[PDB]
Design a protein around this ligand. Structure first.
Ligand SMILES: CCCCCCCCCCCCCCCCCC(=O)OC[C@H](COP(=O)([O-])OCC[N+](C)(C)C)OC(=O)CCCCCCCCCCCCCCCCC
Ligand SMILES: CCCCCCCCCCCCCCCCCC(=O)OC[C@H](COP(=O)([O-])OCC[N+](C)(C)C)OC(=O)CCCCCCCCCCCCCCCCC
Ligand SMILES: CCCCCCCCCCCCCCCCCC(=O)OC[C@H](COP(=O)([O-])OCC[N+](C)(C)C)OC(=O)CCCCCCCCCCCCCCCCC
Ligand SMILES: CCCCCCCCCCCCCCCCCC(=O)OC[C@H](COP(=O)(O)OCCN)OC(=O)CCCCCCCCCCCCCCCCC
Ligand SMILES: CCCCCCCCCCCCCCCCCC(=O)OC[C@H](COP(=O)(O)OCCN)OC(=O)CCCCCCCCCCCCCCCCC
Ligand SMILES: CCCCCCCCCCCCCCCCCC(=O)OC[C@H](COP(=O)(O)OCCN)OC(=O)CCCCCCCCCCCCCCCCC
Ligand SMILES: CCCCCCCCCCCCCCCCCC(=O)OC[C@H](COP(=O)(O)OCCN)OC(=O)CCCCCCCCCCCCCCCCC
Ligand SMILES: CCCCCCCCCCCCCCCCCC(=O)OC[C@H](COP(=O)(O)OCCN)OC(=O)CCCCCCCCCCCCCCCCC
Ligand SMILES: CCCCCCCCCCC1=C(C)C(=O)C(OC)=C(OC)C1=O
Ligand code: SF4
Lengths: 47, 104, 70, 105, 156, 98, 80, 169, 318
């Protein structure tokens, strides 16, 4: 029975599966800049 | 009572050290400086849950030095080896189903 | 040479020696020249409170021997 | 669906933690062991309906052992009347209720 | 009087503490990194002066600029300098950090790091020896020793 | 009855009405659930120590172990919800109205 | 079984020591002659009070004094 | 005052529960539940549950609330009216209950409650050379055989269940 | 009189933590073929004083914090737990003689990860929080083997009482019946205090210790001195636990000298391990816990349960 409140309701998907609806980027540098110190690394980490 | 006095004294000395370490370097007026979700990992949460469940198994294991004093020693030894074996079986299922991977 | 580290180790060793020696001397000063009574179990506390009541001075460490009976 | 498997097989899975009057480690008595033993040995075998109206005195003594409501209410009455008589000045406390009498043992 | 004496002895205490516990951040940009690493090597050994090797850049006292500052790393230099807690000092090590050096006329080199940060000690060389850098560190300590922060505070 | 039992039961009801009135976060709901467990732990422990009922001294430990494993299950549910929707909000869990 | 044992002792000796120590801990108390004495010592440790018996007239094994001959003895524990 | 120590710790306990249950954020709610667990542990310790209070610290605060703060740190973001209003609401309800049960030595919310210090209800005897609480917990291995079986089975199943539902497949 | 005893515990703790920095820099100096500090004091003895006065008048760094309250409470909790871990330590007499001192220390050390967690929350950087969660997962991982090794050793002690553990070791050091427990204990306490080769926050294998990152952090001296109080305390606890000394009840100073010398040697062993090895990768010390230490710890736990039963050597409760 359609009402004003239950008006926007669509039926669920047929397989009852909904759409799902990234990875880290690190701008890296050497810890103590004694040895290298002049390195820049743009990482793309996945954890 | 003496425990509460000692806890209050340790808390007081710690708070005094923290209050000094925040307010003593504010004595020297400095040049006021005017220039100018996190990614989820499943393994980080899984190592914490594995910790929690093995810690509950440890909570079962903690009354053993009192449990050896019993007169029902055969039952006690059976259940003691059984709890340590179930902890080992939890570890083996955590092993073999790729649960301890990339934080091994 | 390597014996130059021994003044710092000696100062740190004196600083670790102070707490234990301190608590032993304070336990002997607060308890009539003897060890502090250890009451982990309620029987030990019962005997200790009985000592406090029989000593007459509200102090468990005042020991009453055979001079207290007739 | 109380499938009484324990009484059927003779196993004791949880009857040991069930009451306070059971076998305890190192024979430690519960603080209301006698009251619970009296209420259980009263109410045994006669069912709940007869047990609520025929073993009422044993259960009341046992509930008042557990909760100590009548004891604390009685001490409240005595302590309030004592404090009223102290405030009115019509009562003095004895030396053995002030720490002045070198206790018994 | 009495207050001048008290602020003089307190200057002596805090200057002693700050010079005798220098924690260096090193911009090891170029060849002078190798010679600072020799100044921390067991012969010269900065750590016996209180000058710890590989200190944290977040809690460092002196920024040792040891190498060629290029135009591409000048804002990173200034950013690390701006993240330093005061009192912060800067030792400029070597000719390229002092004045451009061998790359003075380059299109891509900052002609001395003093165009970017204030410099306290200029240590000359290509590279200056590890002994010469330790000389510059001890001259920085002498410069801290004659500071008058509380005496000038008292006289204002 | 005793005066501390009032406060421990009132703590249970405070964490109950916290758990029965969500704001946004499912984590705060789980915090209220384990506060309910904490108040139950303290209340059972005070009864069992007061009664000198010896064998039920192992009861609050079994309560703690089972309900902390329950809490681990709930945190894993929250983690799967957070990996679905990005947050742990209970207003994102509304697909089952239709 | 000798090839597998040397192979797992070459590849995973921590697990071999683990299963060996665990297997000894399982099967060893049933083979030890002193496992009896653990039970004997735990049941001989007097936590409670030895609540005495009313002498009805026929209890020949129960002593009348602690230093009497009859009764349970711990000479096996003094000697071992 | 000092005879009311368990009562004062229980008041701090209820204040901490009104604190986190009003739900400012799961971070501060976790902090309030930590302080509440500590003071409720002190309540347990002042009856002679020394092992059970150390079980609170070691297990509850030590493992489980650490895992709650850990999982909160992975699910909240680091940088109201209703929280502070419900906080002072619960605080006023609790202090009105305190005031009634103190001025009257009696109250009835759901049950009747004494107003004296809960020192009154203790035992006047000893336990000898053991703790009764320690021996009752030690009997988990000689008397709680079925209890150990079902607890260990639930924990093993719990490990299996967490590895199932966090797998995503 | 009791407050005198509390202060003569806790103030020499801070002085020993001060001079442990000197002992560390010197002993790491001579092992690295150089000297440690010898300029600031005679033989370097004024280096902790100068360094502490320097750290206490240094500016709060640059940035602001996400949560003021946890930024304050994390050093308070760290120092409070680092000071309360010392009060049941029997040396030969504990300050607070409790029946459950072992379980007290295990619980208060389990509470120590909240300082790391709240300092990760209180920083503004979302990368420092990730580093804090890695550190929390490390510390809670090695607390498992701390608990089980500690339980396995206490099965020969009879109780959780720390003062009984002097009586237990009157005939032999307890490292002789339990040396695999002792070495996994020592390495697990090493991995507890974030100490090299397990120091991933203070080193590399870290997403945030990477030179010109954000993250307002606390005053470094407080967490540092809490950490060194924990290092000296865990070495004293290992000394009590496995290398317990002779105690004459009429001469307590003999036990105090003996456990002090052993605790100094064991803290220098921490210093000598950190100057000898490279660092683990994070999953390598997760491997070392979960796949290496925990199987042997469970196996030796079964062994130390069943072993006093089969040898008729069950220790007394009292
Ligand atoms: C107990 C553990 C160790 C604790 C630390 C060691 C003990 C010593 C503590 C006090 C150290 C000295 C005072 C603080 C440092 C002052 C340094 C400084 O630059 O001061 C300039 C500051 C400000 O000087 P200013 O006015 O010239 O400011 C310079 C900055 N501009 C111009 C940009 C604004 O001096 C003061 O604020 C004076 C502080 C009090 C002086 C000492 C009084 C007694 C203290 C006890
Ligand atoms: C899986 C099964 C593991 C337990 C094996 C038996 C261990 C044991 O000694 O049990 C005796 C113990 C205790 O027996 P007991 O002989 O010590 O009893 C003497 C009486 N008391 C305890 C008061 C000293 O348990 C039982 O007899 C009953 C409980 C367990 C029943 C079987 C459970 C099976 C679960 C399958 C799922
Ligand atoms: C208390 C005072 C101090 C105590 C001693 C400690 C001082 C010495 C410290 C040295 C420096 C250590 C720095 C950190 C090192 C960390 C790395 C490391 O060692 O990893 C451990 C390594 C890890 O393994 P791994 O990484 O080297 O090897 C590869 C591992 N797999 C195959 C999984 C990839 O070994 C262990 O885990 C051993 C732990 C202790 C072993 C105890 C042995 C017991 C033996 C019983 C008998 C066995 C015989 C068979 C059965 C017989 C039955 C009758
Ligand atoms: C009313 C009167 C009081 C007024 C207020 C003052 C209070 C007292 C403050 C301390 C004393 C003030 C003077 C401080 C030192 C001044 C003199 C000085 O710097 O002498 C230099 C000398 C070493 O010479 P140097 O220049 O280093 O040469 C290199 C080696 N050839 O240096 C040395 O030989 C060593 C100098 C050591 C400094 C003193 C010792 C340290 C401070 C101890 C007290 C404060 C800290 C207490 C503990 C804090 C926590 C650990
Ligand atoms: C009568 C029944 C209720 C008894 C307790 C009343 C306490 C006072 C609160 C009254 C209701 C206030 C309210 O609107 O609560 C809703 C709130 C969740 O809403 P939120 O997402 O924060 O904001 C959007 C607004 N709907 O929900 C909350 O803030 C929940 C907080 C609950 C914590 C209870 C604390 C103790 C209260 C007294 C003891 C019970
Ligand atoms: C019976 C007494 C009670 C026994 C139960 C109690 C055990 C206590 C110890 C707890 C151990 C917990 C973890 C167990 C996990 C077992 C599964 C496993 O580890 O398999 C993987 C392993 C290969 O390792 P991998 O996956 O490659 O590791 C990464 C690095 N390469 O695979 C292997 O290395 C092979 C593992 C299986 C074979 C091991 C044989 C050891 C034999 C020792 C002597 C006999 C001892 C008695 C027990 C019977 C053993 C057959
Ligand atoms: C449990 C044990 C704990 C032990 C903790 C302490 C360990 C180290 C012990 C001290 C070792 C020796 C320290 C010597 C420091 C330097 C003294 C000195 O003379 O410094 C020179 C400086 C300037 O003197 P000036 O007048 O310029 O001389 C020119 C001469 N024509 O003169 C000055 O700066 C003025 C004088 C400063 C003297 C400072 C002495 C050290 C103070 C340290 C603080 C703690 C004191 C001990 C507290 C605990 C024990 C009671
Ligand atoms: C962020 C907030 C601030 C953070 C910094 C400060 C808080 C954290 C650090 C403090 C932690 C306190 C832990 C104190 C309890 C430890 C357990 C305990 O009491 O053990 C000692 C002892 C047990 O041994 P036993 O011999 O069996 O008992 C005596 C009978 N003969 O038992 C006794 O001796 C019993 C003595 C009486 C009971 C003591 C109760 C203490 C007060 C209540 C808890 C206080 C802490 C609350 C907050 C915790 C952290 C949030
Ligand atoms: C209350 C006493 C405070 C003393 C403070 C001493 C701090 C340590 C100085 C040297 C040092 C060591 C050993 C150190 O290990 C370390 O971490 C890598 C530092 O930070 C960069 C250090 O600066
Ligand atoms: S001043 Fe010279 S030697 Fe030094 S870093 Fe520059 S180019 Fe290299």
């Amino acid at each position: 029975y359609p009402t004003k409140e239950t008006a926007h309701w669509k039926p669920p998907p047929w397989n009852d599966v909904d759409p799902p609806k990234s990875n880290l980027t690190l701008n890296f540098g050497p810890q103590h800049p004694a040895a290298h110190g002049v390195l820049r690394l743009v990482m793309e980490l996945s954890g | 009572m003496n425990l509460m006095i000692t806890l209050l004294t340790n808390f007081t000395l710690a708070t005094l050290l923290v209050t000094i370490a925040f307010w003593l370097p504010q004595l020297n007026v400095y040049s006021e400086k005017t220039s100018p979700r996190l990614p989820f990992s499943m393994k980080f949460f899984l190592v914490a849950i594995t910790f929690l469940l093995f810690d509950l198994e440890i909570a079962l294991l903690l009354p053993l030095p009192w449990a050896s004093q019993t007169t029902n020693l055969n039952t006690m030894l059976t259940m003691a080896l059984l709890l340590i074996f179930l902890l080992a079986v939890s570890l083996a299922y955590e092993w073999t189903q790729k649960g301890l991977e990339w934080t091994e | 040479m390597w014996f130059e580290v021994l003044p710092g180790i000696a100062v740190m060793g004196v600083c670790l020696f102070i707490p234990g020696m301190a608590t032993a001397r304070i336990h002997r000063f607060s308890n009539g020249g003897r060890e502090k009574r250890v009451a982990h179990y309620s029987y030990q506390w019962y005997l200790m409170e009985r000592d406090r009541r029989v000593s007459g001075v509200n102090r468990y460490y005042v020991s009453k021997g055979l001079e207290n009976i007739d | 669906p109380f499938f009484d498997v324990q009484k059927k097989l003779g196993v004791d899975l949880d009857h040991w933690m069930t009451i306070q009057s059971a076998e305890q480690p190192h024979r430690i008595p519960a603080r209301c062991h006698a009251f619970e033993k009296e209420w259980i040995e009263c109410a045994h075998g006669i069912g709940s309906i007869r047990a609520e109206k025929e073993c009422k005195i044993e259960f009341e003594d046992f509930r008042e052992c557990l909760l100590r409501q009548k004891t604390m209410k009685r001490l409240n009455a005595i302590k309030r009347q004592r404090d009223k008589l102290i405030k009115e000045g019509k009562y003095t406390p004895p030396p053995h209720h002030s720490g002045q009498e070198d206790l018994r043992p | 009087s009495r207050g001048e004496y008290v602020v003089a002895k307190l200057d002596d205490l805090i200057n002693w503490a700050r010079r005798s516990s220098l924690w260096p951040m090193t911009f090891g940009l170029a060849c002078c990194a190798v010679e600072m690493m020799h100044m921390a090597a067991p012969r010269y050994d900065m750590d016996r002066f209180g000058v710890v090797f590989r200190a944290s850049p977040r809690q460092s006292d002196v920024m040792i600029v040891a190498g060629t500052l290029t135009n591409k790393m000048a804002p990173a230099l200034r950013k690390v300098y701006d993240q330093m807690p005061e009192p912060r000092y800067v030792v400029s090590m070597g000719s390229c950090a002092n004045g451009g050096g061998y790359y003075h006329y380059s299109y891509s080199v900052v002609r001395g790091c003093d165009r970017i940060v204030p410099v306290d000690i200029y240590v000359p060389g290509c590279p200056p020896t590890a002994e010469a850098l330790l000389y510059g560190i001890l001259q920085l300590q002498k410069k801290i020793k004659r500071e008058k922060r509380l005496r000038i505070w008292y006289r204002r | 009855m005793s005066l501390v039992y009032m406060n421990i039961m009132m703590a249970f009801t405070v964490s109950l009405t916290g758990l029965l009135m969500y704001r946004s976060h499912l984590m705060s709901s789980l915090l209220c659930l384990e506060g309910m467990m904490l108040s139950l732990f303290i209340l059972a422990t005070l009864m069992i120590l007061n009664s000198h009922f010896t064998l039920a001294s192992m009861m609050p430990i079994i309560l703690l172990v089972f309900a902390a494993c329950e809490a681990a299950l709930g945190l894993s549910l929250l983690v799967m919800v957070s990996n679905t929707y990005g947050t742990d909000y209970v207003q994102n869990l509304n697909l089952l109205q239709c | 079984v000798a090839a597998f044992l040397k192979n797992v002792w070459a590849k995973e000796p921590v697990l071999v020591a683990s299963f060996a120590i665990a297997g000894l801990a399982v099967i060893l108390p049933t083979l030890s002659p002193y496992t009896k004495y653990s039970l004997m010592i735990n049941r001989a440790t007097p936590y409670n009070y030895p609540v005495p018996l009313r002498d009805d007239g026929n209890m020949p094994d129960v002593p009348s004094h602690p230093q009497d001959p009859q009764g349970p003895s711990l000479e096996w524990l003094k000697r071992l | 005052m000092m005879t009311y120590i368990v009562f004062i710790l229980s008041i701090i306990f209820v204040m901490g529960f009104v604190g986190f249950s009003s739900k400012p954020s799961p971070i501060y709610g976790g902090l309030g539940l930590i302080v509440s667990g500590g003071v409720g542990c002190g309540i347990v310790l002042n009856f002679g549950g020394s092992f059970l209070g150390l079980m609170v610290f070691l297990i509850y605060l030590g493992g489980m609330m650490v895992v709650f703060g850990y999982t909160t740190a992975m699910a909240t973001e680091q940088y109201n009216k209703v929280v502070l209003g419900t906080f002072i609401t619960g605080l006023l309800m609790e202090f009105l209950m305190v005031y009634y049960v103190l001025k009257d030595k009696e109250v009835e919310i759901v049950f009747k409650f004494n107003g004296m210090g809960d020192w009154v209800i203790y035992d006047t005897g000893d336990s000898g050379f053991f703790s009764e609480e320690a021996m009752g917990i030690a009997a988990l291995y000689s008397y709680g055989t079925w209890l150990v079986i079902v607890t260990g089975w639930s924990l093993l199943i719990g490990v299996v269940v967490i590895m199932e539902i966090t797998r995503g497949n | 009189m009791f407050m005198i005893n509390v202060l003569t515990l806790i103030i020499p703790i801070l002085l020993a933590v001060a001079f442990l920095t000197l002992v560390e820099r010197k002993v790491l100096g001579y092992m690295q073929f150089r000297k440690g500090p010898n300029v600031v004091g005679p033989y370097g003895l004024l280096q902790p004083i100068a360094d502490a006065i320097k750290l206490f008048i240094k500016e709060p760094l640059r940035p602001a914090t996400s949560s003021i309250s946890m930024f304050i409470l994390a050093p308070i909790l760290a120092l409070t737990l680092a000071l309360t871990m010392w009060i049941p330590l029997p040396m030969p007499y504990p300050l607070i003689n409790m029946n459950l001192g072992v379980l007290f220390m295990l619980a208060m050390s389990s509470l120590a990860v909240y300082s790391i967690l709240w300092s990760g929350w209180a920083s503004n950087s979302k990368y420092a929080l990730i580093g804090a969660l890695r550190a929390v997962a490390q510390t809670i991982s090695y607390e498992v083997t701390l608990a089980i090794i500690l339980l396995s050793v206490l099965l020969m002690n009879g109780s959780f009482t720390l003062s009984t553990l002097i009586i237990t070791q009157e005939q032999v050091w307890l490292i002789f019946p339990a040396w695999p427990l002792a070495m996994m204990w020592f390495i697990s306490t090493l991995a507890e205090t974030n100490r090299a080769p397990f120091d991933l926050t203070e080193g590399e294998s870290e997403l945030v210790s990477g030179f010109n990152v954000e993250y307002a952090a606390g005053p470094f001296a407080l967490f540092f001195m809490a950490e060194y109080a924990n290092i000296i305390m865990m070495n004293i606890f290992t000394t009590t636990l496995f290398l317990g000394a002779f105690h004459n009840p009429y001469m307590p100073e003999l036990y105090t000298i003996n456990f002090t010398i052993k605790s100094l040697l064991l803290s220098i062993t921490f210093l000598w391990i950190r100057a000898s090895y490279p660092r683990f990768r994070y999953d390598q010390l997760m491997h070392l816990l979960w796949k290496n230490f925990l199987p042997l710890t469970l196996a030796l736990c079964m062994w130390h349960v069943s072993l006093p039963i089969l040898l008729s050597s069950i220790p007394p409760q009292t």
